[PDB]
Design a protein around this motif. Structure first.
Motif, PDB file in Angstrom:
ATOM      1  N   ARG B   1       0.827  -1.202   0.000  1.00 26.16           N
ATOM      2  CA  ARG B   1       0.000   0.000   0.000  1.00 26.16           C
ATOM      3  C   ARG B   1       0.866   1.258   0.000  1.00 26.16           C
ATOM      4  NH1 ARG B   1      -1.756   2.315   5.813  1.00 26.16           N
ATOM      5  NH2 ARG B   1       0.062   1.608   7.018  1.00 26.16           N
ATOM      6  N   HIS B   2       0.345   2.334   0.581  1.00 31.16           N
ATOM      7  CA  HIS B   2       1.093   3.577   0.714  1.00 31.16           C
ATOM      8  C   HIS B   2       2.093   3.448   1.862  1.00 31.16           C
ATOM      9  CE1 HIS B   2      -3.154   3.976   2.227  1.00 31.16           C
ATOM     10  NE2 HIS B   2      -2.485   4.004   3.365  1.00 31.16           N
ATOM     11  N   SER B   3       2.714   4.566   2.245  1.00 32.63           N
ATOM     12  CA  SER B   3       3.698   4.591   3.322  1.00 32.63           C
ATOM     13  C   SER B   3       3.063   4.091   4.616  1.00 32.63           C
ATOM     14  CB  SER B   3       4.267   5.999   3.502  1.00 32.63           C
ATOM     15  OG  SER B   3       3.498   6.753   4.420  1.00 32.63           O
ATOM     16  N   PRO B   4       3.837   3.452   5.500  1.00 35.33           N
ATOM     17  CA  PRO B   4       3.212   2.796   6.664  1.00 35.33           C
ATOM     18  C   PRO B   4       2.538   3.756   7.629  1.00 35.33           C
ATOM     19  CG  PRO B   4       5.422   1.934   6.249  1.00 35.33           C
ATOM     20  CD  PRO B   4       5.278   3.165   5.412  1.00 35.33           C
ATOM     21  N   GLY B  16     -20.150 -13.414  11.859  1.00 36.21           N
ATOM     22  CA  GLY B  16     -20.014 -14.843  11.664  1.00 36.21           C
ATOM     23  C   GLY B  16     -19.485 -15.276  10.316  1.00 36.21           C
ATOM     24  N   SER B  17     -18.943 -14.357   9.522  1.00 37.49           N
ATOM     25  CA  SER B  17     -18.431 -14.686   8.202  1.00 37.49           C
ATOM     26  C   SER B  17     -16.946 -15.042   8.293  1.00 37.49           C
ATOM     27  CB  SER B  17     -18.685 -13.529   7.238  1.00 37.49           C
ATOM     28  OG  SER B  17     -17.865 -13.631   6.088  1.00 37.49           O
ATOM     29  N   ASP B  18     -16.304 -15.217   7.141  1.00 37.85           N
ATOM     30  CA  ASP B  18     -14.890 -15.555   7.060  1.00 37.85           C
ATOM     31  C   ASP B  18     -14.214 -14.654   6.038  1.00 37.85           C
ATOM     32  OD1 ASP B  18     -13.509 -18.777   7.765  1.00 37.85           O
ATOM     33  OD2 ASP B  18     -12.397 -16.950   7.276  1.00 37.85           O
ATOM     34  N   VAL B  19     -13.121 -14.015   6.452  1.00 38.79           N
ATOM     35  CA  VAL B  19     -12.404 -13.066   5.605  1.00 38.79           C
ATOM     36  C   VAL B  19     -10.912 -13.222   5.862  1.00 38.79           C
ATOM     37  CG1 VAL B  19     -14.350 -11.449   5.606  1.00 38.79           C
ATOM     38  CG2 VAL B  19     -12.510 -11.168   7.267  1.00 38.79           C
ATOM     39  N   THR B  20     -10.120 -12.951   4.830  1.00 37.97           N
ATOM     40  CA  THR B  20      -8.669 -12.917   4.928  1.00 37.97           C
ATOM     41  C   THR B  20      -8.190 -11.471   4.856  1.00 37.97           C
ATOM     42  OG1 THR B  20      -8.481 -15.101   3.893  1.00 37.97           O
ATOM     43  CG2 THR B  20      -6.515 -13.721   3.911  1.00 37.97           C
ATOM     44  N   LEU B  21      -7.175 -11.149   5.658  1.00 39.32           N
ATOM     45  CA  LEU B  21      -6.664  -9.782   5.748  1.00 39.32           C
ATOM     46  C   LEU B  21      -5.138  -9.785   5.714  1.00 39.32           C
ATOM     47  CD1 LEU B  21      -5.915  -8.902   9.147  1.00 39.32           C
ATOM     48  CD2 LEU B  21      -8.338  -9.551   9.186  1.00 39.32           C
ATOM     49  N   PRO B  22      -4.543  -9.486   4.562  1.00 37.58           N
ATOM     50  CA  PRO B  22      -3.090  -9.325   4.481  1.00 37.58           C
ATOM     51  C   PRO B  22      -2.661  -7.876   4.645  1.00 37.58           C
ATOM     52  CG  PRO B  22      -3.993  -9.453   2.281  1.00 37.58           C
ATOM     53  CD  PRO B  22      -5.172  -9.501   3.230  1.00 37.58           C
ATOM     54  N   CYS B  23      -1.401  -7.703   5.037  1.00 39.14           N
ATOM     55  CA  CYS B  23      -0.813  -6.378   5.221  1.00 39.14           C
ATOM     56  C   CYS B  23       0.102  -6.087   4.035  1.00 39.14           C
ATOM     57  CB  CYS B  23      -0.060  -6.286   6.545  1.00 39.14           C
ATOM     58  SG  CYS B  23       1.034  -7.669   6.936  1.00 39.14           S
ATOM     59  N   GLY B  24      -0.401  -5.310   3.082  1.00 42.53           N
ATOM     60  CA  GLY B  24       0.388  -4.914   1.936  1.00 42.53           C
ATOM     61  C   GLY B  24       0.449  -5.979   0.856  1.00 42.53           C
ATOM     62  N   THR B  25       1.342  -5.739  -0.105  1.00 39.85           N
ATOM     63  CA  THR B  25       1.558  -6.638  -1.232  1.00 39.85           C
ATOM     64  C   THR B  25       2.801  -7.504  -1.050  1.00 39.85           C
ATOM     65  OG1 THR B  25       2.088  -6.703  -3.594  1.00 39.85           O
ATOM     66  CG2 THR B  25       2.630  -4.685  -2.385  1.00 39.85           C
ATOM     67  N   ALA B  26       3.098  -7.900   0.185  1.00 41.87           N
ATOM     68  CA  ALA B  26       4.283  -8.697   0.460  1.00 41.87           C
ATOM     69  C   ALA B  26       4.129 -10.112  -0.094  1.00 41.87           C
ATOM     70  CB  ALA B  26       4.559  -8.749   1.963  1.00 41.87           C
TER      71      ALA B  26
END
Ligand SMILES: *[C@@H]1O[C@H](CO)[C@@H](O[C@@H]2O[C@H](CO)[C@@H](O)[C@H](O)[C@H]2NC(C)=O)[C@H](O)[C@H]1NC(C)=O
Ligand SMILES: *[C@@H]1O[C@H](CO)[C@@H](O[C@@H]2O[C@H](CO)[C@@H](O)[C@H](O)[C@H]2NC(C)=O)[C@H](O)[C@H]1NC(C)=O
Ligand SMILES: *[C@@H]1O[C@H](CO)[C@@H](O[C@@H]2O[C@H](CO)[C@@H](O)[C@H](O)[C@H]2NC(C)=O)[C@H](O)[C@H]1NC(C)=O
Ligand SMILES: *[C@@H]1O[C@H](CO)[C@@H](O[C@@H]2O[C@H](CO)[C@@H](O)[C@H](O)[C@H]2NC(C)=O)[C@H](O)[C@H]1NC(C)=O
Ligand SMILES: *[C@@H]1O[C@H](CO)[C@@H](O[C@@H]2O[C@H](CO)[C@@H](O)[C@H](O)[C@H]2NC(C)=O)[C@H](O)[C@H]1NC(C)=O
Ligand SMILES: *[C@@H]1O[C@H](CO)[C@@H](O[C@@H]2O[C@H](CO)[C@@H](O)[C@H](O)[C@H]2NC(C)=O)[C@H](O)[C@H]1NC(C)=O
Ligand SMILES: *[C@@H]1O[C@H](CO)[C@@H](O[C@@H]2O[C@H](CO)[C@@H](O)[C@H](O)[C@H]2NC(C)=O)[C@H](O)[C@H]1NC(C)=O
Ligand SMILES: *[C@@H]1O[C@H](CO)[C@@H](O[C@@H]2O[C@H](CO)[C@@H](O)[C@H](O)[C@H]2NC(C)=O)[C@H](O)[C@H]1NC(C)=O
Ligand SMILES: *[C@@H]1O[C@H](CO)[C@@H](O[C@@H]2O[C@H](CO)[C@@H](O)[C@H](O)[C@H]2NC(C)=O)[C@H](O)[C@H]1NC(C)=O
Ligand SMILES: *[C@@H]1O[C@H](CO)[C@@H](O[C@@H]2O[C@H](CO)[C@@H](O)[C@H](O)[C@H]2NC(C)=O)[C@H](O)[C@H]1NC(C)=O
Ligand SMILES: *[C@@H]1O[C@H](CO)[C@@H](O[C@@H]2O[C@H](CO)[C@@H](O)[C@H](O)[C@H]2NC(C)=O)[C@H](O)[C@H]1NC(C)=O
Ligand SMILES: *[C@@H]1O[C@H](CO)[C@@H](O[C@@H]2O[C@H](CO)[C@@H](O)[C@H](O)[C@H]2NC(C)=O)[C@H](O)[C@H]1NC(C)=O
Ligand SMILES: *[C@@H]1O[C@H](CO)[C@@H](O[C@@H]2O[C@H](CO)[C@@H](O)[C@H](O)[C@H]2NC(C)=O)[C@H](O)[C@H]1NC(C)=O
Ligand SMILES: *[C@@H]1O[C@H](CO)[C@@H](O[C@@H]2O[C@H](CO)[C@@H](O)[C@H](O)[C@H]2NC(C)=O)[C@H](O)[C@H]1NC(C)=O
Ligand SMILES: *[C@@H]1O[C@H](CO)[C@@H](O)[C@H](O)[C@H]1NC(C)=O
Ligand SMILES: *[C@@H]1O[C@H](CO)[C@@H](O)[C@H](O)[C@H]1NC(C)=O
Ligand SMILES: *[C@@H]1O[C@H](CO)[C@@H](O)[C@H](O)[C@H]1NC(C)=O
Ligand SMILES: *[C@@H]1O[C@H](CO)[C@@H](O)[C@H](O)[C@H]1NC(C)=O
Lengths: 303, 282, 178, 303, 178, 282
Positions: B1-4, B16-26
């Motif tokens: 993403r942009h600067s930290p 009650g759903s399911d989601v994935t959450l990554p930090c940036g494009t690593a």
């Protein structure tokens, strides 16, 4: 900003097809060619049945039509996209009337005639069907239409005028509606065979002497009977105050005063007397029995 | 993403759903360690370089921080807020003032954890209304009337907007049915020295009614002691005075007054309270 | 008797006619059709545009003084009575036609009572001849849907006029009369 | 061989004189001049009243004429010496009709109107008198003539059509005969003051528990009442089987079920309940009481 | 059914009509007047001379064979029915007019039954059109005494014709029919 | 008067009246003696030369003879007959034969001792009848009919002439009311060998009826035991035969038959007698 639906107020049968169109008025008729939808009796028709012809006409195809929900006819409303009412129409569907059957008439004291018939067809009840009663003499007379309808219930008429005796009558019912017309079969009826009279009034039950198991029931003959053409036949029944079963007495045709037997002392009984005419100076067959009189209670003096 | 060190992004999720959450494009073969509210997370939850949440509850919302392994170097910050899609609102309007317009509110039966956006639109047959509102509390159109006996059914619709869903509700009414004034104010009862078994009750007219002389109201009175706890109803005509003769010699009474137009609308609520004592010679 | 008992009698008769009209309108909407039986059913008025309306402003309603109000009530009631008498040919039901005839007789009696109240107060206008063009209003050629729309709008306008006449009678009995 | 009597069908008053002549046709009219005699209603008039004028004319002088025996008129027959009927005539005498008085009307369930009046004059009953009833609204209406006469007795009329409520009516009776015409005074009548209803049907008396001196009487309100314009007030009475005296109970206006007290155990009682409307939304005066219902007998269970 | 039940029905109807005519004639003579109420009252017939009589010789009555008798009965009954229907305007009484209408209906039914009996035996003469001049016979200008005489003579002739028709029906049922 | 040996004169006097009877034109101072039936009279009854009878009874009628004193010289003979003035006769006619005419008699309720003279005159509306009579017994017109259903009431009048007074009586009737045939003849009952409780009764037709086939009669039968003395009525149709099943096993019965036209006239008298016995096997 109005629409026109064609055809206007058509007439079809149960099962026939129907083709209607709704043409809106708009200068850029682009979105209006697909925004219009059909609604029948407040129910939105599926969009799969409707078809588009051009920018200012919508097509609808229906088949196997059923009976109308109301006698006024089904309402077909062409609605807009926002829900506005553009135009409306009415649909009349039904079946032609058949010949009525099961016609019966009765006369009260030879002073009036009341007939009751049954349609017998399930296709005529959807549309408005006209029912007329015609009565006349067999050999010398003219057609006469009954006026007072619904004197006792549905499909009935009352003839208050006096009718000639010792002469058969021809009575038939005619059915007419928007589709067709039908006439019932001619029925030969004699007034002397459907004689009906009123129950004997003034029912008085009194004790006799000191007997605890015997009573006396007396009444007055109905003054409506002329006593010259026929003779009535009485019938007596009684019950226990706490029991629902009824005990019937044999013919008491002649005796205006009858005494019961086998009664339990110290018990209240309800007496109901009815009379039935017989056949004199003609067919000896009896007539229709009358309704029971008002219950008159009496107490047996116990020992 | 942009600067930290930039402002974190906001993401919403259902219950009650399911989601994935990554930090940036690593890359997927990177050493990633997550932290929430200042505490470290167990490595048994990380799916490579991403974070998967199975069946989130209300206690999982907050700031999801992604740092380097065994360091304090930030890379991506995201705020997670869990909410519930809105249901159909409850709409029912009422005219506190018959000569003037009416007003009403809208609220959801089940409260949500995300602020929604509402819409107001009144039709009144084929027309356009304003619904101008500068009130103290929100959810109040405060529309004004323009005609009398217009013979046109009013139609208002309420809409709700949300990042998880939306709904709509519309009702229809007329100016003759939804009419209910406010209860009377300053209900005070005073005794009478002449008759001991008699009480005098006096009330006032609510200041909301603009024309109390052109559109009169039909008052209602309810009296009941404290120990018998049984109310007896009595209907009164136009007037702010009443004379009750069912008072006891040494018992207290509770009075309640209502308000209603002559033949328009329904009854209103009762008064707040009332207490009085009969006369006693000693 | 003067204006004492007459206004009360007119008020009671208007209330009775309002109740009977509510019942008759419910019955007619149940008999008309499924679309006309819906709770809201608010279409644009296009079929009936000749009958007099009952929409008036507040200041205009307060400006009239016991004469224009009564004249408008009389003419509107006569027009509504003529329309409801002509409406008898549409319905085909024994009890419905009997109720229609009863309501027509009651409305004629209410019109007569209103005329008597107007003549009792000492106004030199007992019956100023109105209209005479719609005195009968024979049913012209029209569709069935348009006829049902006209009937619905006529019933709604009759209800509105009954409400307005009740309000006007209450105002006259309260403010202008002791 | 016929005669002619003059004047033919005259019209006179009670007490006026009468002059009639009978001229026979005969060529030698010698014996016929005194052989003819007069006969009135089958009674031979005395020869002292008749006078002879010439050979072919006979004179008769009568005075202080009285009322006619029949409505058709007295018969004056000129008889011959042998008893043959030569000619005949009719005499019409009476008095002009006066203004009728004592007019009263009553309404049954606000669905019909029945009025009853009285002539009040003894001079109009001799000749045929026409009686017509006119009813209309006071402020806006037209004259309407009643058609159904003699619904309850002499000098009465029945109005089956519905009438407007909360509006006074003007009812008057007009008398017309061969002599003159008269109109009764205008009577202002309100329908809300002459309301009459039917007695409450379905009268059932049942016991309660084991009490021997208490009973229960329940009934059903008459469905003819709309319950919106007024409220009925019931009244109960009972008697002993062997006693003719009746004991009346106080107002039971609201309670559809009432319990008696003070009854003797082991006795049959007859219960008759009647209802009477009251005044709501108008004059608070009650209406005309209705007839008693049919007697329903019940027995008290003795100990 | 043939001639079996039809002749018996006609006989019973003639007997019933004879009884009703006796009662009606008694009532009309009691209502007419004291002179017409006398037991004998035999005046010379001068007012009514147009109605057909019922006087026939023995040999002439025996000569006719089931056709002339029935035709004469039909025409005389039609004439008497027309006269009795026209006689309704003279009497003014509710019960008397009701009895007159009942007797008129019964006589019309008897005429229809006689026509049916004539048509059932196979005679090619169901209804030969008689008269049509006295088909209505409107009441002309006449005196009251002459009117009462006409009514009395009409009642007497109707009684005589009823007796003659009963005798003829009995003769036909006995001799000419099994 | 004329010669003494002439035929005596007849003089009539009422009952209980007074009348004088002188014999000739002799002087008042003459010696007059009277004799009746051959015996002399008392001198206390003579009023000079006349004989006065005060309140005559029936036993004073006869030949009043007036002779000279103490001699047998006759001067005047006269027969005295006392009678009663006639009353109103009783007239009621009856037609024994319906196709033919009728006949009737006339008689006084109180019999008189003087033969009277009768008159017969029938009107029949406006006409003239004959009343020709050559019968065995007197007082019978035996008039004959001329038409059928003439619709004219017959009127007959009977007059009585007498030297003491006169009277008149007239009645009116029609041909339909006065009709009564004669009772049947030769009523014989025979038993039946098959059924014991059954009897066969047979009668005939009176020969007076000229046309029994054109004008049939409706018979009537009455049966009764001798010890029970209670009659039971039964009506029969056209026919001269009857089968009764109410017969006893060993009791006798009396049968009586009547006669009457179909619907004209009244009933006639019963039969003379009838005796029969039931069947008994021995
Ligand atoms: C759109 O389509 C409709 C239906 O096909 C057309 O209406 C028809 O027009 C023809 C001649 O113009 C008539 O003969 C038909 O009777 C019409 N049918 C109906 C159902 O209306 C219409 O003309 C078309 N419009 C255009 C612009 O093409
Ligand atoms: C008229 O009757 C037909 C026959 O029952 C109805 O057609 C059915 O409609 C339902 C729902 O639309 C379908 O599930 C069925 O498959 C249909 N059956 C057939 C044989 O077509 C039709 O809906 C009825 N129409 C109305 C207006 O009631
Ligand atoms: C008309 O009358 C006939 C004769 O009674 C009826 O036919 C009978 O109906 C009953 C009642 O449903 C059945 O139990 C019998 O089996 C029927 N008998 C026959 C021979 O069909 C008939 O139902 C009547 N129709 C109507 C419309 O009332
Ligand atoms: C853990 O991460 C691996 C790698 O990203 C996931 O494996 C992928 O799963 C998806 C969906 O099943 C497939 O489309 C990919 O092809 C898989 N990639 C590889 C390299 O196998 C795995 O599903 C994740 N586990 C969980 C529980 O989410
Ligand atoms: C992380 O900290 C935040 C801040 O306190 C928590 O958010 C609060 O949570 C409580 C409990 O549910 C709520 O009552 C507050 O309204 C929340 N505040 C705000 C501003 O949303 C959050 O729950 C914490 N998360 C974890 C996993 O501990
Ligand atoms: C608008 O709100 C209504 C009311 O809750 C929703 O209807 C519910 O939908 C859910 C999911 O489809 C069902 O499980 C419920 O049974 C429904 N309830 C009712 C009363 O119908 C509707 O789904 C909402 N619309 C949208 C677009 O979210
Ligand atoms: C919800 O409210 C918004 C705000 O007024 C509406 O948006 C406007 O709608 C009008 C009418 O269509 C347009 O003329 C404006 O241009 C719209 N403005 C904007 C900024 O979009 C919106 O239409 C409403 N939605 C509903 C469903 O009523
Ligand atoms: C017998 O007397 C009568 C009555 O006086 C005469 O009749 C009158 O005649 C004159 C002229 O002739 C008329 O003006 C009268 O009107 C007649 N009166 C009546 C009552 O009829 C009759 O003319 C006389 N006859 C003779 C021969 O002298
Ligand atoms: C009419 O009434 C008068 C008065 O009562 C009757 O005249 C009386 O007649 C009787 C007998 O004829 C006489 O004895 C009286 O002297 C008469 N009195 C008077 C005052 O005249 C007359 O008879 C009556 N007429 C009729 C037809 O009834
Ligand atoms: C009309 O009504 C009045 C009032 O009730 C009657 O007058 C009373 O009649 C009764 C009965 O005869 C008498 O006892 C009273 O003395 C009368 N009172 C007065 C003041 O006259 C009158 O009789 C009625 N008339 C008719 C024809 O019925
Ligand atoms: C007895 O005879 C003498 C003489 O005749 C009667 O006297 C006569 O009586 C009549 C009537 O009383 C008188 O007119 C004569 O003048 C009398 N004549 C004389 C001479 O006196 C006498 O009446 C007779 N007695 C009786 C009882 O008859
Ligand atoms: C005189 O003699 C004659 C002849 O016998 C009597 O006349 C008879 O009288 C009896 C008795 O009353 C009658 O029964 C006879 O009928 C009479 N015969 C005749 C022919 O009339 C007469 O009674 C005697 N008179 C006296 C006074 O002795
Ligand atoms: C004709 O006969 C009648 C019947 O007896 C006579 O009438 C009686 O006359 C006497 C004397 O006048 C009275 O005492 C009787 O009371 C009368 N009876 C009846 C029934 O009226 C009449 O007098 C006779 N006529 C003649 C001229 O002798
Ligand atoms: C009684 O009978 C005699 C005998 O027939 C009648 O005398 C005849 O009457 C007719 C009719 O008037 C005359 O033409 C004859 O000339 C009379 N003859 C004689 C010898 O007098 C007499 O008229 C009858 N009387 C009554 C009252 O009827
Ligand atoms: C039915 O009859 C009535 C009167 O007889 C008539 O007015 C109506 O039009 C008729 N209806 C039909 C459908 O024939
Ligand atoms: C009925 O029969 C009895 C005895 O048989 C009889 O007395 C009575 O008259 C009869 N009823 C009639 C109406 O004839
Ligand atoms: C009475 O009225 C009837 C009908 O209204 C009429 O026929 C009759 O001629 C009238 N009689 C008189 C005497 O006016
Ligand atoms: C009559 O009064 C009782 C008690 O006061 C009440 O319950 C009832 O409803 C009343 N009747 C009516 C018809 O209101």
């Amino acid at each position: 900003h109005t629409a026109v639906i064609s055809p206007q107020d058509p007439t079809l049968l149960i099962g026939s097809s129907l083709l209607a169109t709704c043409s809106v008025h708009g200068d850029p008729p682009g979105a209006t060619a697909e925004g219009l939808y059909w609604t029948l009796n407040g129910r939105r028709l599926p969009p799969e049945l409707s078809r588009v012809l051009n920018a200012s006409t919508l097509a609808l195809a229906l088949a196997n039509l059923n009976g109308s929900r109301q006698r006024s006819g089904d309402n077909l409303v062409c609605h807009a996209r926002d829900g506005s009412i553009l135009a409306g129409s009415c649909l009349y569907v039904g079946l032609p009337p058949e010949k009525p059957v099961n016609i019966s008439c009765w006369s009260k004291n030879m002073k009036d005639l009341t007939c009751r018939w049954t349609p017998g067809a399930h296709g005529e009840t959807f549309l408005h069907t006209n029912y007329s009663l015609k009565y006349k003499l067999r050999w010398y007379g003219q057609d006469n239409t009954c006026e007072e309808y619904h004197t006792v219930g549905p499909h009935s008429c009352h003839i208050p005028k006096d009718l000639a005796l010792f002469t058969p009558y021809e009575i038939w019912v005619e059915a007419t509606n928007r589709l067709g017309s039908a006439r019932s079969d001619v029925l030969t009826l004699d007034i002397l065979d459907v004689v009906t009279t009123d129950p004997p009034p003034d029912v008085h039950v009194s004790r006799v002497g000191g007997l605890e198991d015997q009573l006396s029931v007396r009444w007055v003959s109905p003054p409506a009977l002329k006593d010259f053409l026929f003779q009535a036949k009485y019938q007596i029944r009684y019950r226990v105050e706490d029991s629902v079963d009824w005990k019937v007495v044999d013919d008491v045709s002649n005796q205006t005063s009858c005494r019961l037997a086998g009664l339990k002392p110290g018990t209240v009984y309800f007496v109901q007397v009815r009379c039935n005419p017989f056949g004199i100076y003609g067919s000896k067959k009896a007539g229709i029995w009358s309704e029971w009189s008002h219950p008159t209670a009496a107490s047996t003096p116990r020992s | 993403r942009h600067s930290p060190q930039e402002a974190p992004h906001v993401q919403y999720e259902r219950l009650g759903s399911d989601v994935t959450l990554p930090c940036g494009t690593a890359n997927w073969d990177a050493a990633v360690t997550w932290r929430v509210n200042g505490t470290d997370l167990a490595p048994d939850l990380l799916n490579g370089s991403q974070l998967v949440l199975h069946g989130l509850e209300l206690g999982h919302s907050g700031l999801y921080a992604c740092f380097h392994r065994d360091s304090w170097h930030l890379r991506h910050q995201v705020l997670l807020h869990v909410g519930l899609p809105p249901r159909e609102p409850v709409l029912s309007c009422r005219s506190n003032t018959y000569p003037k317009g009416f007003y009403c509110s809208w609220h959801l039966p089940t409260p949500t954890y995300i602020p929604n956006t509402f819409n107001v639109t009144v039709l009144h047959g084929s027309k356009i209304m304003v619904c101008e509102k500068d009130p103290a509390l929100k959810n109040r159109c405060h529309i004004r009337y323009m005609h009398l006996f217009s013979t046109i059914k009013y139609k208002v619709s309420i809409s709700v907007s949300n990042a998880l869903g939306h709904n709509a509700t519309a009702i229809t009414f007329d100016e003759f049915t939804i009419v209910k004034p406010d209860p009377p104010e300053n209900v005070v009862a005073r005794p009478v020295p002449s008759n001991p078994r008699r009480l005098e009750v006096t009330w006032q007219t609510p200041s909301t009614w603009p024309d109390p002389e052109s559109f009169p109201l039909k008052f209602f009175l309810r009296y009941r002691p404290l120990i018998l706890d049984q109310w007896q109803h009595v209907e009164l005509s136009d007037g702010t005075a009443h004379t009750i003769t069912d008072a006891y010699a040494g018992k207290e009474y509770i009075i309640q007054v209502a308000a209603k137009d002559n033949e328009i609308g329904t009854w209103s609520d009762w008064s707040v309270a009332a207490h009085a004592t009969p006369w006693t010679e000693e | 008797p003067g204006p004492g008992p007459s206004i009360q009698k007119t008020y009671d008769l208007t209330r009775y006619l309002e109740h009977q009209l509510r019942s008759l309108a419910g019955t007619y909407l149940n008999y008309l059709g499924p679309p006309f039986n819906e709770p809201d059913f608010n279409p644009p008025r296009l079929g009936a545009e000749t009958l007099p309306r009952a929409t008036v402003d507040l200041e205009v309603w307060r400006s009239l003084n016991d004469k224009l109000r009564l004249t408008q009530n009389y003419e509107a009631y006569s027009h509504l009575l003529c329309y409801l008498r002509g409406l008898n040919r549409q319905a085909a039901t024994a009890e419905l036609r009997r109720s229609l005839a009863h309501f027509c007789t009651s409305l004629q009696g209410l019109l007569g009572s209103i005329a008597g109240v107007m003549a009792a107060l000492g106004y030199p206008l007992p019956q100023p001849l109105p209209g005479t063009e719609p005195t009968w209003t024979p049913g012209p050629a029209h569709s069935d849907f348009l006829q049902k729309m006209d009937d619905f709008w006529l019933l709604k306008e009759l209800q509105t006029w009954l409400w307005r006449s009740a309000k006007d009678f209450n105002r006259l009995k309260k403010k202008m009369q002791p």
